[PDB]
Design a protein around this ligand. Structure first.
Ligand SMILES: C=NC(=O)c1cc2ccc(-c3cc(Nc4ccnc(N)n4)ccc3O)cc2s1
Length: 279
């Protein structure tokens, strides 16, 4: 029950990790990086922030959430002086496995087992009154390249300690589900179609998909936030709850995600701004 509180180290991060000026210079510009622990040799991830209230918020929330088996663990946080400018250097577990959809790009039950995982990340956050507000393809990473890797939620730049915010996380869940089951997002102006909730479940991709499953997506994508299901109701849905009573039925996802790649950069982009719009 009792876990340690957050301790910001003030020694030069380069005492503890191999990091170079080149791999530091790319950091101040948002990118997260490959670093190595000197004592153990293990691989970790570095993310660099300029110290400021926003950065302190992120670190704080992320530390609080690290506990979850389904959220990237903060391992250390440093407060250093970089080129005469205060910085927060965040050290994280390394996620070799790449982004959720990049994997698939290589089964209904597999789709469900994934959503249950993203589901736990959200339940944990919501239990401790945090809303993530940027749950999307590139914040879902697999620990390693093994078939059995754990999928983890990352990036708390927009997380917010509290509901409208929470329902934003549920909407993402709907969108990630839709794509998982077919390989393309819903709402196929864009802004208008989202406002209007204008999506469908096209054959062929959706012909042998349970009405129960569609109803589920339908609840998550509700245009009126107070109408969406909550994480608890999501997590108690049969499709999610018993992820091993769900039919091994094949999905067009992997093929579609392969042919229709090149659009992938555009859907990552649309979803990022949809999210930006609901914040
Ligand atoms: C495939 N070549 C490699 O050898 C790897 C390079 C990287 C680079 C980064 C990460 C990694 C990335 C993130 N990403 C972000 C981005 C933004 N915010 C947050 N909190 N995390 C979070 C945790 C991570 O381990 C894993 C690897 S594996």
């Amino acid at each position: 029950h009792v876990k340690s509180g957050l301790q910001i180290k003030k020694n030069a991060i380069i005492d503890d990790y191999k990091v170079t000026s080149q791999v530091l210079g790319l950091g101040i510009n948002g990118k997260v990086l490959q670093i190595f622990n000197k004592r153990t040799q293990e691989k970790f991830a570095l993310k660099m922030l300029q110290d400021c209230p926003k950065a302190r918020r992120e670190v704080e929330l992320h530390w609080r959430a690290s506990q979850c088996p389904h959220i990237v663990r903060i391992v250390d946080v440093y407060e250093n002086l970089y080129a005469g400018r205060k910085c927060l250097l965040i050290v994280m577990e390394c996620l070799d496995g790449g982004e959720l959809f990049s994997r698939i790009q290589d089964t209904e039950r597999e789709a469900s087992e994934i959503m249950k995982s993203i589901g736990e990340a959200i339940q944990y956050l919501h239990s401790i009154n945090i809303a993530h507000r940027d749950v999307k393809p590139e914040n879902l990473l697999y620990t390693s390249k093994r078939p059995n890797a754990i999928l983890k939620l990352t990036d708390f730049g927009f997380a917010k300690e509290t509901k409208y915010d929470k329902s934003c996380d549920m909407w993402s869940l709907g969108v990630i589900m839709y794509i998982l089951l077919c390989g393309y997002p819903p709402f196929y102006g864009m802004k208008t179609r989202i406002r209007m909730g204008q999506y469908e479940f096209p054959n062929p991709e959706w012909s042998e998909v349970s009405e129960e499953v569609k109803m589920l997506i339908r609840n998550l994508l509700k245009t009126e936030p107070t109408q969406r299901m909550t994480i608890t109701e999501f997590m108690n849905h049969p499709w999610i709850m018993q992820s091993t009573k769900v039919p091994q039925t094949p999905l067009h996802t992997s093929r579609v995600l392969k042919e229709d790649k090149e659009r992938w950069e555009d859907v990552k982009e649309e979803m990022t701004s949809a999210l930006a719009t609901m914040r």
